[PDB]
Amino acid sequence: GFTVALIQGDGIGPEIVSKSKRILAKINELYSLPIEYIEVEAGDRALARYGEALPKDSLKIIDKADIILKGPVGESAADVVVKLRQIYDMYANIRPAKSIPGIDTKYGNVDILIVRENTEDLYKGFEHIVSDGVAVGMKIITRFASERIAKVGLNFALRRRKKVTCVHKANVMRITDGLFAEACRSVLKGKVEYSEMYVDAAAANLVRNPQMFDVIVTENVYGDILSDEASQIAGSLGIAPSANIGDKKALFEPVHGAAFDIAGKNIGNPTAFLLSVSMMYERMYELSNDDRYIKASRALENAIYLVYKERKALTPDVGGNATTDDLINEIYNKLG
Amino acid sequence: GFTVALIQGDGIGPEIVSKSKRILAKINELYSLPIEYIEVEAGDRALARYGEALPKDSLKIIDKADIILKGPVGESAADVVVKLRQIYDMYANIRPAKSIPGIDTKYGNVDILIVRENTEDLYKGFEHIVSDGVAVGMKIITRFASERIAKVGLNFALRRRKKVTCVHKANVMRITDGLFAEACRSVLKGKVEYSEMYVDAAAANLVRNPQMFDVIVTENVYGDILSDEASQIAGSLGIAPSANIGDKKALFEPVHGAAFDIAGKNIGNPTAFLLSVSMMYERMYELSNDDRYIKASRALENAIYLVYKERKALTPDVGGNATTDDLINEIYNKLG
Amino acid sequence: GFTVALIQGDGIGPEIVSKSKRILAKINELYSLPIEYIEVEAGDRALARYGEALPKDSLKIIDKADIILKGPVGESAADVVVKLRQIYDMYANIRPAKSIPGIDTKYGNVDILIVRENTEDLYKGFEHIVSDGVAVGMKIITRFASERIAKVGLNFALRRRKKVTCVHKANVMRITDGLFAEACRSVLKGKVEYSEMYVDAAAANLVRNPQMFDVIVTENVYGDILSDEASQIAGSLGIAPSANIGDKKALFEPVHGAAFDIAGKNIGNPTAFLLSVSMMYERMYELSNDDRYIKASRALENAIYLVYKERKALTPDVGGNATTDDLINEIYNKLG
Amino acid sequence: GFTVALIQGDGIGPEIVSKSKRILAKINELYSLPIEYIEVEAGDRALARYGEALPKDSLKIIDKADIILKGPVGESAADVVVKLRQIYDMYANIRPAKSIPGIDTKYGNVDILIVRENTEDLYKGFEHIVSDGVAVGMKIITRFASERIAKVGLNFALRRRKKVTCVHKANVMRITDGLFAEACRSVLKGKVEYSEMYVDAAAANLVRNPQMFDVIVTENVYGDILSDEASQIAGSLGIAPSANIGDKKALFEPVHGAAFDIAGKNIGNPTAFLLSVSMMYERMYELSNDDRYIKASRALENAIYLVYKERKALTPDVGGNATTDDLINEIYNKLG
Ligand SMILES: [Mg+2]
Ligand SMILES: [Mg+2]
Ligand SMILES: [Mg+2]
Ligand SMILES: [Mg+2]
Incomplete structure (x- = not known):
């Protein structure tokens, strides 16, 4: 009950x-x-x-x-x-993007699931004006939250096409995203089909061929952006469901x-x-x-x-x- | 010469x-x-x-x-x-997105110009591991870098369709992005058609109707993502030119x-x-x-x-x- | 009037x-x-x-x-x-420490003036709990405040014994204190007898021979501590005057x-x-x-x-x- | 062996x-x-x-x-x-301050033991120049490092006069020092005579009556300063031993x-x-x-x-x- x-x-x-x-x-x-x-x-x-x-x-x-x-x-x-x-x-914000017959007249075979960390990153509000004209914001990313979000990713992947893609930008942000991508690997690697993509590439790939994706695990911000893009491709943003688990x-x-x-x-x-x-x-x-x-x-x-x-x-x-x-x-x- | x-x-x-x-x-x-x-x-x-x-x-x-x-x-x-x-x-990273008659577009005729701040934000690599499994990045937004990128946005707009859109996320990052948007206004307001859009809306509107956009002025990270999304929509990433001014x-x-x-x-x-x-x-x-x-x-x-x-x-x-x-x-x- | x-x-x-x-x-x-x-x-x-x-x-x-x-x-x-x-x-917190006849029965010739920056450093309150058991505080030091405090130092030195000592810890904190010590030099060097001392040494030197000091210019925190020590040496903390100019x-x-x-x-x-x-x-x-x-x-x-x-x-x-x-x-x- | x-x-x-x-x-x-x-x-x-x-x-x-x-x-x-x-x-930097009968003291007989956290705080060098003439240092205080230093403080107290004093500045740094002081309490309270003192009071009380102190547990920076003040008071800096445990x-x-x-x-x-x-x-x-x-x-x-x-x-x-x-x-x- x-x-x-x-x-x-x-x-x-x-x-x-x-x-x-x-x-x-x-x-x-x-x-x-x-x-x-x-x-x-x-x-x-x-x-x-x-x-x-x-x-x-x-x-x-x-x-x-x-x-x-x-x-x-x-x-x-x-x-x-x-x-x-x-x-x-x-903590987990789930955003599915599935092609709806009639509204998606461009691809027709979109079936994405975006798992977005919803507790840390830059969306926790730790910012100040430190000096005149100068503003500082703190991006905080822990392995605790990074593993919890990954586990959710694994559960959704396991009942879908067993394919996960950790999206980040660790080539530039070696420490923050590098930590997120490491915690992604500890959980996903060896249990599902695993791969990593850079956030800018994923933004371009969603347009070129979104059918290449099944589940996507990413951080608070990158996920805020990619979610909306994904939904609009699948058909319409006004038709999009959302969850916070x-x-x-x-x-x-x-x-x-x-x-x-x-x-x-x-x-x-x-x-x-x-x-x-x-x-x-x-x-x-x-x-x-x-x-x-x-x-x-x-x-x-x-x-x-x-x-x-x-x-x-x-x-x-x-x-x-x-x-x-x-x-x-x-x-x-x-x-x- | x-x-x-x-x-x-x-x-x-x-x-x-x-x-x-x-x-x-x-x-x-x-x-x-x-x-x-x-x-x-x-x-x-x-x-x-x-x-x-x-x-x-x-x-x-x-x-x-x-x-x-x-x-x-x-x-x-x-x-x-x-x-x-x-x-x-x-400091200015220019990324045009313009469809070429001939190559597959599937989105119509787009003529988008993205102007990206390329010196501050999270890409200056000010991050460290503070404690076990806890990473911290610093996002830096200044009035100086922000007015400079807005002036570059003004030059390009003036000799195009005289329309600018400041892309940011000041609804959640009140201080950092808020300072960016304020710098965007004191320079652009009155001199061109000026509007502001949240980065997730933009990621979606770039797919719904990209012809609503002329010049986009944004930050280092947001512009990194939207640039690649915009180039794919217009045509291909392999046809895309780039500039750093x-x-x-x-x-x-x-x-x-x-x-x-x-x-x-x-x-x-x-x-x-x-x-x-x-x-x-x-x-x-x-x-x-x-x-x-x-x-x-x-x-x-x-x-x-x-x-x-x-x-x-x-x-x-x-x-x-x-x-x-x-x-x-x-x-x-x-x-x- | x-x-x-x-x-x-x-x-x-x-x-x-x-x-x-x-x-x-x-x-x-x-x-x-x-x-x-x-x-x-x-x-x-x-x-x-x-x-x-x-x-x-x-x-x-x-x-x-x-x-x-x-x-x-x-x-x-x-x-x-x-x-x-x-x-x-x-911004300027002035703290004189002068020997009072009868109460100082150890030195007898103390005549210190401590000029303490009172607006930045760690005393501006920019701190958060970023993760479980982990607290981060921001130490913010600008050249603007650093030069203003130095100018006050110069004015008090000029009507006393023309001797200033910039106290800091730039050997460990190369960037923050290094910036403070640089701004100290731009103003003081060449106009008064100038020297630099490390905060721990100054704490020991106040005890060994405080008569070696005339005016001291330092930051918010270091100054909070050194002031009280200096006053107690001069005689009594309950006799100590204070100003905020x-x-x-x-x-x-x-x-x-x-x-x-x-x-x-x-x-x-x-x-x-x-x-x-x-x-x-x-x-x-x-x-x-x-x-x-x-x-x-x-x-x-x-x-x-x-x-x-x-x-x-x-x-x-x-x-x-x-x-x-x-x-x-x-x-x-x-x-x- | x-x-x-x-x-x-x-x-x-x-x-x-x-x-x-x-x-x-x-x-x-x-x-x-x-x-x-x-x-x-x-x-x-x-x-x-x-x-x-x-x-x-x-x-x-x-x-x-x-x-x-x-x-x-x-x-x-x-x-x-x-x-x-x-x-x-x-992690533990031990600095005893003990007068030796023979050498000039001028403060009586002191027997002070300072226990200093020597891994975090501001001394890990996490600082950068964020904008022109604006520097930022990060102060890191963790529950882990803080309990560890308090346990070391307990060992030394137990075989001395069973008295401990946590030195900090939680009145102004509510979050950072506050976390330090809380770690200090959960370990020391009940097991020894325990009190807390503000760093500026301590700097002054070390001159007024140093015999009120037995074991002092403090942070990296505060302990750096008070250590040198305490060694001078006891005798000389050239007679002072040091340890890192x-x-x-x-x-x-x-x-x-x-x-x-x-x-x-x-x-x-x-x-x-x-x-x-x-x-x-x-x-x-x-x-x-x-x-x-x-x-x-x-x-x-x-x-x-x-x-x-x-x-x-x-x-x-x-x-x-x-x-x-x-x-x-x-x-x-x-x-x-
Ligand atoms: Mg949200
Ligand atoms: Mg780049
Ligand atoms: Mg004060
Ligand atoms: Mg040391």
Whole structure:
């Protein structure tokens, strides 16, 4: 039994999540999943009703929860996601980039998984103005975090095509990246097909032939950049799912923001959200080993690819003229 | 006048460069260009003939020279280029990304100019191992280096589409990138169309629509990555020219390596090299204000564009079947 | 005309300052000094009446004042002195160490002046925990601050024995202290008797023979340590005066704390306070060049040495049995 | 048993050391000490005889040796001592300050033991010039190095007056020194009389009353300064012994240099050297747990104390008029 904290959020969050509960229920039924969805408030509407973005009562329900399933948050996204990440130590940021039929009309065979270290590097904020016009920032990279991220890489590789590529820039940064690349090797080498690529080359190679990649393990920054590039190649950044996995707690969300310009027009695309749910199921299979959840993930992911291939009910963002309701219905019919 | 240190280099360097002298000579007399070319030896071949990769007699000549024109260098590339860039303070790294009609693009017509700070950031190698398994790098951003790179960005924009985009990550690095962006504004705001974009957005927008970009001004690291992504999108990395511009010294080279595997087969593509020469002429114009150099620049760029459009004598790297002598000849007929 | 902001402070501050106004008035009279003493509240009693240690009304009266003359502050000393230093940029911390008759029974001829840089080094607080069990602190030293501190050194040397000693540790810290020692030389060398000493040697030399020193210019930390040592040798740390001089604003105070254990017993020693007033007068001679204030400084300083030599009315801290009132009276009689 | 690499060194080194072998030999047979002395060449004299200051044949022997006993080294001191201290991880720098009855003290009887961390802090030389006239040093404090130095502090305290004082500056450096002090507490609190003192207070209290101190545990830099202050107070820097203790290698030397000005006059004082030997025996006791070494230590310390008390055969550096042979002889008669 898993307990999932459901967050609607702002903008098109409420429309996307609330209308997706139909699919979330059809799957608990069809595959007999013991998932409890207890929803809580967080974001810009919670800051207006109460005084905090992450209300006291909400934090207490998330703490007793296994997984956090959220839609997009507004202006307060930084106080909700970041603070929630460092207290439940959700170090691994997973970013899949898979070709979607119809949207990728250039390659068609992209299947990348980017494992990105999300705790150190330059994104921890240790910077100062040391003198007039002079700013110094500290890049901190440890072998502890470097091995933990690698282990996650190994787990995803082992159930995919057994191929990992450690991406870095150790030719210039001998010490920092050199340490990251060494810890990469201690874990991966000899257990999977291993190779190393320089960050600039990988940025060029993603364009030339992204099918050469399976799993990519890289650092916080390099990963921030390569992820977005990869998603856009696979088709669209507005369709991209995201996850932040820790040892005892995980978080699944879409990459796209709250999108206030289209909020309420009933045309927001629920695809990113729904693919993050597919990952969430996959995470319930690593924690339970009960293949009951893996079946639900494949079923939801193939339902999505089928609607995109037919082109009969897509939202405006991807060239359709159907609503969010029509798209969800098409996925609900091909579910079983 | 101008004095140029010419370096043939290794692998395909000797073939490419020596055969391109015909072209370098025809232009000097066609546009009455006072350029003196004095070749020096450097690279792997010089390490085996003499004792050093960069002989004292070579350094003596490059010291009096205005511009450094070079072909690809072998294994000792990292000891030459980098050193010369530091002692002659060649801070601006120019990387154009321009599609050539003829070669496969699959992204449309792109005309992007990336201007990269090439002296500070994380690439100055200020990093150490502080404790067991703990490494620390220092990122340095200064007002000085940042205004200087923005001024170079302004020059190039002004004679292109007058559009600039500062790429950074000030949302997460408030102090370091924030100082970069502020320097970018005090120089560019008001003088050109100016916008700022986060590096991960840019990595993605470069794939979604690269035609939205004209001149990009960014940091050492971010520019290192985006440069290679932009060159692939436009065409190939083997067609890509490069430049390193200082106040009183400039260097022009192809991006491609020595390519020992095809050396001597007489098939190395001189395009990247000849486009470097074209950039050189562009820099001689800024220095002398004599538009003869700009006319020589357009004349050379044009000639290669015509031969590519005709597709009758291309090299095998771009789908042709002609020799490196045939392609140079076709550019020589389109010149006069 | 000078306007001095008078602060009583806590503990023995109120007793020391308020009873010293007799001497402060006798000198304005005897030497016709145009000094306006307008007193303001700051410290632990101000935090109890109002809500801030440095009340809004107080800050506004200090801003229109030239010099700040304070007694000791209590628990809130860090929010009063430090914040007041960095907004009026009072970089130079002056610490004289002069033998007092009767208390120095070991050397008898100590006359040191320590000029201590008070803005950079390690005392600016740029430190983080980068990893588990690992802490990093940044030592930042600029040539700007290094030359400003040296210039102050030169001014004090020029009206004393024309002898300066730059103290550092550049043999180990080639870059940081090496830069400090270079900036020391640019200013001092060729204008005064110049020499360099290593910090550990100076710590030993102060004990062996402190008469070898006149003025000492050193960095924030080394100076924090050497100052206290020097004062204790000269006689007593509880007798030591202190100053923080800036370009447009100065601050004079005793080194000793509020001393709550003896507060109200009418036995606190006013000597430290009164010698800081002697420095304050000296500072009015650098800003006015009117030797009227220099006369008042020598007169107050000799009045103090005379009472210490006679031993008839000293406070318990230095072996007497007289009160703070009796000591002030003896100085008031030998004033004129 | 123990094997000792003996190094005569330069200047007065050869005279002092060679004449002290008589003493080293008499003790080995008087207390049945299994110590093998194997002399190696190192210093300026070795740089002129052979080619290196620290010959390969010397390093070979020191590698198999347990303890390194050395006399003063000339100009090449910084290349030997420092290197050997880094590759054999000799982290604890012991600096006793003990008055000898006979020599001028002027501070009473002091018996201070300073234990200095000698591997991290600011002395690992992690500093760079980041911008024009701006230098940055990195101060590194670790939990590991700090507990290790506190354990060494505990050993020495336990066999002295069971009193320890952690010297630091955590009031201003909250993070760095704060971590040092915390490591100091978890090891010392409860096992000995434990207090903490700020470095500037200590510099002053060392002059006011040094008898309040027994064992001092501090950092690399603070201990560098206070060590020299404490040795002067106790007596002289030329009488001061020094030690550098690692887990599997230890080094013992005098603090004084080679003193070329008096070399050959047969007047160099062997006290510092012989007190180093005494410390060595103390370390052999901790390693073997055989009190024969401790008896040899007290026996040697005592003999020198008797000759100093009698004042009949002292060297000119301490007011005597005897030769370096006479003083060694008097210690040899007081031994048997
Ligand atoms: Mg993030
Ligand atoms: Mg480069
Ligand atoms: Mg201070
Ligand atoms: Mg040392």
